[PDB]
Amino acid sequence: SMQEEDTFRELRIFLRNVTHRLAIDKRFRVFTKPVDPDEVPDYVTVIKQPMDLSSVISKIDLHKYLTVKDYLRDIDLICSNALEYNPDRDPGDRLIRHRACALRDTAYAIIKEELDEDFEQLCEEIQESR
Ligand SMILES: C=C/C=N\C(=O)[C@H](CCCNC(=N)N)NC(C)=O
Ligand SMILES: [Cl-]
């Protein structure tokens, strides 16, 4: 129905706003763009599903997220990709990991404070109906 379509539009608006707030945060610059194969040619071989915040915006716009849970899977993938690709004790890897955990924790905290649980539940029920 049009009211279901309005629901998903509201979801996209909400997700774009959360993703913009993450993308403008200086700590999260490394997560804003896909990794350049030049810098890092083994990236695309180690990490089987790369994900970054510009890809997340593209997916919102392509209507790939019908629930906040589905969007959070992608935030979680940005984080887990960084933990897996940079697992060493050296400062460069520890800084990326700390920033990745911070991305994840920040996205979850914004959603906890600003997503209405009944709105998520509505999205879930429409999704489940299709
Ligand atoms: C789960 C993500 C949380 N953050 C981190 O990864 C950071 C940075 C890596 C250092 N320690 C190891 N991870 N071994 N660690 C903290 C909080 O000290
Ligand atoms: Cl830096």
Residues 83/100, Cβ–Cβ less than 8 Å: yes
AA letter at 118: D
Q: What is the resolution of this structure in A?
A: 1.5
Q: What is the CATH number of the domain that holds 68?
A: 1.20.920.10
Q: What is the per-residue DSSP string for 60-91?
A: HHTT--SSHHHHHHHHHHHHHHHHHH--SSSH
By residue range, what is the domain housing residue 32?
A: 1-130
- Give the residue from 73, 76, 88 showing the smallest Cα distance to 31: 76
Number of domains in the chain: 1
The finding on whether 109 has its CB within 6 A of some atom of ligand 1 is no
> Whose CA is closest to 78, among 99, 38, 51?
51
Dihedral sign for Cα 94, 100, 102, 104, please: negative
Closest to 107 in 3D by CA, of 17, 7, 10:
17
Beta strands in the chain (DSSP E): none
Distance, in Å, from the CA atom of 36 to the CA atom of 54, rounded to the nearest integer, reads 14
Angle at 100 between CA 97 and CA 102, to 5 degrees: 110
User: Mutation test of ligand 1: which of 27, 79, 84, 101 has the most ligand atoms closer than 8 Å to its C-beta?
Assistant: 101
